[PDB]
Write a protein that binds this ligand. Structure first.
Ligand code: VK4
Length: 259
C-alpha cells in the first residue's frame, strides 16, 4: 500500500471498532462512582460457584459476539477463506475480549464494571479461580497504565486478531499480508500522534495466551465438577469454543459469519 492507503486503513479500522465496541467508553467512565456496597459484594460472594460461572459465561459470550462483528467489518477479514476466518476467531476472540476489558477497569481503585456497578476482584470469590482473576486484574492494570485511546485499542485489537502465526491457517500468506498492512496502519498512527513509546510496553503475546489457556483450564475443572450445568445453562457459542467435549464452534461462528 501507499501512504494514502495506510491512512485510509487506519480510519477504516477505527470505524469498525467504534461500531462494535459493546459498551461505550463514556458510559463506563460516567459510572465509576457507582460502586457496589459491602452488602452487595457479600451477596455476590454467597452465590453458588455454578451460578457465577453461568453469569460470567453469558457476559463473555456477548462480548465474543461483538468481536465476531468487529472481525466481519474489519477490512480484509471476510476476503480470507472461511477456514482461516474461523481459525483466527477461535484463537483470537477471547484475547480481543481481554484487551477490550481494560476499558471497564478503574486503575484508581482497582474496580471493574460488572452488572451495573463497579467492584473489586473480591466480587468474584465464588468462582474458585482467584489466581486467574488476579492475573486478569493485573493485566488490565498494566494496560491502563498505557492510557490507550479508543483508536489505539481499535488498531491494537485488529492485530491481536489478524495473527498470521496461528496454527491451522490454509492461506498463510494472505494473512501475513493483511497483518503487515494493519501493522503499518498501527505504527503510522502511533508515529503521527507521537505515541511510539507504547510499543515497547505492550504485553508480550505469551501473556494474552497464558490468560486464555488458564481460562480454558479453570473452565474444564469447573465442568468436571458440574457437567450438567455447562450442558444445560451455558451459551452454545461458549460451550463449543471452550468446553471439554465441545464441537469446536466451527458451525455457530460459521453461521454468524454468514448472516
Ligand atoms: C467476566 C469476568 C471478568 C471479570 O472481571 C473483570 C475484569 C475486567 Cl478487566 C473487566 C471487567 N468488566 C468488563 O469488562 C465489563 C463487564 C460488563 C458485564 C455487564 O454487562 O454487566 C463485562 C463485559 C463483557 C465481558 C465480561 C465482563 C470484569 Cl467483570 C472476572 C470474572 N470473569 C471471568 O472471565 C472469569 C470467569 C471465569 C473465568 C474468568
Amino acid at each position: 500500500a501507499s501512504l494514502t492507503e495506510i491512512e485510509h486503513l487506519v480510519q477504516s479500522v477505527c470505524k469498525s471498532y467504534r461500531e462494535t465496541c459493546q459498551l461505550r467508553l463514556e458510559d463506563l467512565l460516567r459510572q465509576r462512582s457507582n460502586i457496589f456496597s459491602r452488602e452487595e459484594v457479600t451477596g455476590y460472594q454467597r452465590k453458588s460457584m455454578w451460578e457465577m460461572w453461568e453469569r460470567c459465561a453469558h457476559h463473555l459470550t456477548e462480548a465474543i459476539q461483538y468481536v465476531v462483528e468487529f472481525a466481519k467489518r474489519l477490512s480484509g477479514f471476510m476476503e480470507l477463506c472461511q477456514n482461516d476466518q474461523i481459525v483466527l476467531l477461535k484463537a483470537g476472540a477471547m484475547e480481543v475480549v481481554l484487551v477490550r476489558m481494560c476499558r471497564a477497569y478503574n486503575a484508581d481503585n482497582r474496580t471493574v464494571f460488572f452488572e451495573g456497578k463497579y467492584g473489586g476482584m473480591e466480587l468474584f470469590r465464588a468462582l474458585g479461580c482467584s489466581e486467574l482473576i488476579s492475573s486478569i486484574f493485573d493485566f488490565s492494570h498494566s494496560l491502563s497504565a498505557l492510557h490507550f485511546s479508543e483508536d489505539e485499542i481499535a488498531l491494537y485489537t485488529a492485530l491481536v486478531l489478524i495473527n498470521a502465526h496461528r496454527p491451522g491457517l490454509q492461506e498463510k500468506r494472505k494473512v501475513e499480508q493483511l497483518q503487515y498492512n494493519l501493522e503499518l496502519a498501527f505504527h503510522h498512527h502511533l508515529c503521527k500522534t507521537h505515541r511510539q513509546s507504547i510499543l515497547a510496553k505492550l504485553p508480550p503475546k505469551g501473556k494474552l495466551r497464558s490468560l486464555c489457556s488458564q481460562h480454558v483450564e479453570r473452565m474444564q475443572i469447573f465442568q468436571h465438577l458440574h457437567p450438567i450445568v455447562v450442558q444445560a445453562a451455558f451459551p452454545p457459542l461458549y460451550k463449543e469454543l471452550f468446553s471439554t467435549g465441545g464441537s469446536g464452534d466451527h458451525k455457530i461462528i460459521h453461521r454468524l459469519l454468514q448472516e
